[PDB]
């Protein structure tokens, strides 16, 4: 003749979460940048024999 409880009392749980992050960066760009491809010498010949 016994009846069950409507529900069961459960334990309650507390969660504590920590997320920590640090970013660091350095950027440098220095000096003199020269041309590395330049025109070279030229030569040409032309003649009319007849």
């Amino acid at each position: 003749l016994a009846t069950p409880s409507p529900f069961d009392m459960e334990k309650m749980v507390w969660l504590d979460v920590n997320i920590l992050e640090i970013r660091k960066s350095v950027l440098e760009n220095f000096g003199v940048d020269w041309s590395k491809q330049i025109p070279g010498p030229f030569a040409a010949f032309g003649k009319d024999f007849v």
Binding site: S35, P39, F42, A44, G46
Partner: protein
């Protein structure tokens, strides 16, 4: 250096005065220097080198 000569274009009237013409003359292709060195106004028997 190139030569500067007087020439009469083909198909032109014979009485007309001659025009300026050249011998074998090279205009080099300026690869990465294009637009930095003036070639249109350059006197081809180059006077002034640097």
């Amino acid at each position: 250096g190139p030569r500067n000569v007087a020439t009469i274009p083909l198909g032109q009237d014979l009485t007309q005065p001659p025009v300026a013409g050249t011998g074998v003359r090279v205009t080099p292709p300026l690869g990465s220097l294009n637009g930095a060195i003036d070639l249109a106004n350059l006197a081809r028997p180059i006077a002034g080198t640097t």
